[PDB]
Design a protein around this ligand. Structure first.
Ligand SMILES: *[C@@H]1O[C@H](CO)[C@@H](O)[C@H](O)[C@H]1NC(C)=O
Lengths: 49, 42
């Protein structure tokens, strides 16, 4: 699980953009209040090879 | 003598810092703590 990827963002990366940001992605009407929930997702995932 | 650049400038995320100290030019992008106004206290 030590190898990871981003699955969601506001918009696609520019050439050689290197964004570490770990803040909850808001994908709709509800605010995220600093936690995962409805319309509110943590942006990173693991491959688990 | 210097500049901060970034999005939030919060001393938490990735953010460019440039400082001239006369002996050197020092550049950082650090995901690290700095002052909210890091003036050179001569
Ligand atoms: C300027 O910064 C360097 C480290 O990059 C340091 O070694 C040097 O002593 C500094 N000069 C002054 C005048 O503080």
């Amino acid at each position: 699980y030590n190898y990871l990827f981003r699955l969601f963002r506001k918009s696609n990366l520019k050439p050689f953009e290197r964004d570490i940001s770990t803040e909850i992605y808001q994908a709709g009407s509800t605010p995220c209040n600093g936690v995962e929930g409805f319309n509110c997702y943590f942006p990173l995932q693991s491959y688990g090879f | 003598r210097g500049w901060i650049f970034g999005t939030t400038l919060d001393s938490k995320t990735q953010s460019l810092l440039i400082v001239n100290n006369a002996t050197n030019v020092v550049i950082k992008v650090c995901e690290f703590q700095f002052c909210n106004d890091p003036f050179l206290g001569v």
